[PDB]
């Protein structure tokens, strides 16, 4: 049950004035594509606070990638879901190397030890699904699953939340589908033919409700096991499987490349009003 | 659980090319605004057929308005949810005046007798909520609630379906909120101040999931009873209450005026590529 919004004073949306004319803001299956200027964060914050929303954020920091945690977490504190309940889940082979980061109120962090192992990146799907299944369902409403070699520079908030989302890979958002680096070998479960595909989604930022994320990660894990049994490894590993899944199960929101950007590689194009979550040199 | 979509060949959506540049296609709370060119109906038909979706359509035909049923139903057969399961619920004081309309496969019609009574238009909220509650929950997935003094001229399909939707009133989609005919007396439960409001929604086309429609109709009925006890009748009756509800509970899709148009009164502006559901002279 959703209680009523309070009275709010804000600018009237005008039907005969687009928010953005330079970009696609809705997919052909009627999922919003999230860009700056498409949302009123005050309305969305109200909606999600009235539900006492809890967001889980998963991040893997295995072997040398523990070095990225301090900046990742410190900047998440500045920019990720501020004002909402947040539970970080840090998966690592080195629990003692997790930095002691000071958290705002209503935010918590759990360190989950895993075994260290391409395979590091792939096995995230298993670890997220099997068997963090039970824990996530009890503790959070949404899960957000990201790469650690990153920093938050600007707002990443409840505008992303939805049953299932993917994020446009910053190298391919202007590309034709034939150019997307989908798995192209028919022998792989991740196979997508040259005439199929909506977008190329980045493996380092996806999420949704706990139920939908567990479905996605279970399916991707199962598909990766089939490939392993058949002696084939998808070209971009878990990302190839994520792309196959999101082709056949359309996301209910798509995040623009504001949400996953590499300024060193790609600069700061006019079409990006904000750079929210960005690559750190590795 | 949602099964996988099959392989489909269709045009690639391009992020740097809007579908429509002349109109707002997403609200500030990230609800799609449904216009021609924003959706691929083949994708949406697949999604909804894979769930074996059943859509209920409620329509009231009381006193002289039984004359509108033949054209309403015959044109609904041509244009409303074709290919999907449909259950019409015709509420009337004259069961014998309901015309015998030939239905396509997977479609059915029930005649529900009510007592005849502004008040005719208002009491729809009670009749929809109390006590068709039980029946609708067992029989359909979505409910669509419309005026009868209308005809379908073009496609109205699963692109509208969502947990809760309203439709832009064709007289006000280009208007400033101060001009909207909201109830303006603070003594009414439907009261909206001059500095509040997103859109003016038409009382003759709303819908959603059964649960969300029962919430809306229950709330509007309760609010109308409070007004009656306080000796006040909202300026546009049930529509005034619908507008209050949708201000405080944002719809998850908004239908463009393609979905509720009056050509005699308003012509055929360039911004309307299709006239889908239109007023009949009364
Ligand atoms: O030793 C490890 C190795 C990985 N990891 C974990 O796995 C995540 C993904 O790996 P990485 O970021 O290197 O891939 P990326 O290189 O960012 C993967 C991305 O960039 C590619 C170019 O290198 C392509 O653009 C591809 O499309 C894109 O997904 C990393 O952020 C860590 O959370 C870890 O903890 N320890
Ligand atoms: O004797 C009756 C009376 C009503 N009804 C039922 O109630 C529905 C609404 O009434 P109506 O269409 O006259 O209102 P509209 O006039 O279309 C109401 C609409 O137009 C108004 C102008 O007349 C304003 O524009 C208003 O904003 C808008 O809602 C009608 O379609 C029938 O299903 C019935 O069965 N028998
Ligand atoms: Mn990375
Ligand atoms: Mn009418």
User: What would the two tokens of residue A24 be?
Assistant: 């696609």
A259 marked among binding-site residues: no
Whether residue A43 and residue B25 make contact (CB cut-off 8 A), yes or no, is: no
Report how far ligand 3's centroid is from the alpha carbon of B12 (Å).
Answer: 26
A198 marked among binding-site residues: no
Contact A34, B30 (CB under 8 A): yes
User: What would the two tokens of residue A96 be?
Assistant: 């003692």
> Which segments of chain A are extended strands (E)?
33-34, 54-61, 85-92, 107-113, 142-146, 150-152, 164-167, 205-209, 253-255, 277-279
Report how far ligand 4's centroid is from the alpha carbon of A146 (Å).
Answer: 51
**Which residues have C-beta within 8 Å of that of residue A66, sequence separation ≥ 6?**
A92, A94, A97, A98
Cis upstream peptide for B140 (omega within 30°): no
User: What would the two tokens of residue A124 be?
Assistant: 């995230």
DSSP secondary structure string, B51-80?
Answer: TT-EEEEEEEE-GGGGGGHHHHHHHHHHHB
Q: Quick one: CA dihedral A198, A204, A205, A208, positive or negative?
A: positive
Whether residue A24 and residue B14 make contact (CB cut-off 8 A), yes or no, is: yes
Instruction: Please name the residue of chain B whose CA is at the shortest distance from the CA of residue A43.
Output: B29
The rounded distance, in Å, linking the Cα atoms of B180 and B173 is 9
Report how far ligand 4's centroid is from the alpha carbon of B155 (Å).
Answer: 19
Supply the range of the domain harboring residue B72.
1-282
Residues in chain B within 8 Å Cβ distance of A174: 14-16
> Which segments of A48-124 are extended strands (E)?
54-61, 85-92, 107-113
CB neighbourhood size of A97 (10 A): 13
Domain total in chain A: 1
Nearest alpha carbon to residue B156 among B70, B84, B58, B49: B84
Going by alpha carbons, the residue nearest to atom 21 of ligand 1 is A236
Residues in chain B within 8 Å Cβ distance of A7: 193, 196
The rounded distance, in Å, linking the Cα atoms of A137 and A59 is 17
Tally helices (H) and strands (E) across chain A: 8, 10
Task: Specify the residue for token string 């699953």.
Answer: A145
The bound ligand whose nearest atom lies closest to the alpha carbon of A202 is 1
Q: How many cross-chain Cβ pairs, A to B, lie less than 8 Å apart?
A: 147
Name the 3-class secondary structure at B132: coil
Nearest alpha carbon to residue A172 among A164, A163, A180: A180
Name the 3-class secondary structure at A268: coil
Resolution of the entry in angstroms: 1.3
CB neighbourhood size of A112 (10 A): 14
Q: Quick one: CA dihedral B65, B69, B71, B76, positive or negative?
A: positive
Helix axes B238-248, B210-229, angle to 10 degrees: 120
Q: Is A163 exposed, middle or buried (0-12, 13-18, 19+ CB in 10 A)?
A: middle
Task: Give the Cα-Cα-Cα angle A81, A83, A85 (nearest 5 degrees).
Answer: 70
Ligand 1, residue A61: give the atom nearest the CA. Answer: 35
Whether residue B26 and residue A25 make contact (CB cut-off 8 A), yes or no, is: yes
Hey, what long-range contacts does B232-236 have (CB within 8 A, 24 or more apart)? B232/B185, B232/B187, B232/B188, B233/B118, B234/B183, B234/B188, B234/B189, B234/B190, B235/B181, B235/B182, B235/B183, B235/B184, B236/B181, B236/B183, B236/B203
The rounded distance, in Å, linking the Cα atoms of B44 and B30 is 19
Q: What is the experimental method?
A: X-ray
| Chain centroid, CA B117 distance in Å | 23
Instruction: Please name the residue of chain A whose CA is at the shortest distance from the CA of residue B211.
Output: A1
Contact B159, B39 (CB under 8 A): yes
User: What would the two tokens of residue A201 be?
Assistant: 């989604």
Contact A150, A278 (CB under 8 A): yes
**Which residues have C-beta within 8 Å of that of residue A108, sequence separation ≥ 6?**
A86, A87, A88
Contact A86, A57 (CB under 8 A): yes
Q: Gap positions in chain A, given as the residue before each gap (C–N > 2.5 A)? A: 117
Name the 3-class secondary structure at A144: strand
Question: Domain with B191 in it: what CATH number?
Answer: 3.90.550.10
């Amino acid at each position: 049950f959703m209680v009523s919004l309070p009275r709010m004073v804000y600018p009237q949306p005008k039907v005969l004035t687009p928010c953005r004319k330079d970009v696609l803001v809705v997919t052909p299956w009627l999922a919003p594509i999230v860009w700056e200027g498409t949302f009123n964060i005050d309305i969305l914050n109200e909606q999600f606070r009235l539900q006492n929303t809890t967001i889980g954020l998963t991040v893997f920091a295995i072997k040398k990638y523990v070095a990225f945690l301090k900046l990742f977490l410190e900047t998440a504190e500045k920019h990720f879901m501020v004002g909402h309940r947040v539970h970080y889940y840090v998966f690592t082979d080195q629990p003692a190397a997790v930095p002691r980061v000071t958290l705002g109120t209503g935010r918590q962090l759990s360190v989950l030890e895993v075994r260290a192992y391409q395979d590091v990146s792939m096995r995230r799907m298993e670890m997220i699904s099997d068997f963090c299944e039970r824990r996530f369902l009890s503790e959070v409403d949404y899960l957000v699953c990201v790469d650690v070699d990153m920093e938050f520079r600007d707002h990443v908030g409840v505008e992303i939340l939805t049953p299932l989302f993917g994020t446009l890979h910053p190298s391919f958002y202007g590309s034709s589908r034939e150019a997307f680096t989908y798995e192209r070998r028919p022998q792989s479960q991740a196979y997508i033919p040259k005439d199929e595909g909506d977008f190329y989604y980045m493996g380092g930022f996806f999420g949704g409700s706990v139920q939908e994320v567990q479905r996605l990660t279970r399916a991707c894990h199962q598909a990766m096991m089939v490939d392993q049994a058949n002696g084939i490894e998808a070209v971009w590993h878990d990302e190839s499987h994520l792309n196959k899944y999101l082709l056949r199960h359309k996301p209910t929101k798509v995040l623009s490349p504001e949400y996953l950007w590499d300024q060193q590689l790609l600069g700061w194009p006019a079409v990006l009003r904000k750079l929210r979550f960005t690559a750190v040199p590795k």
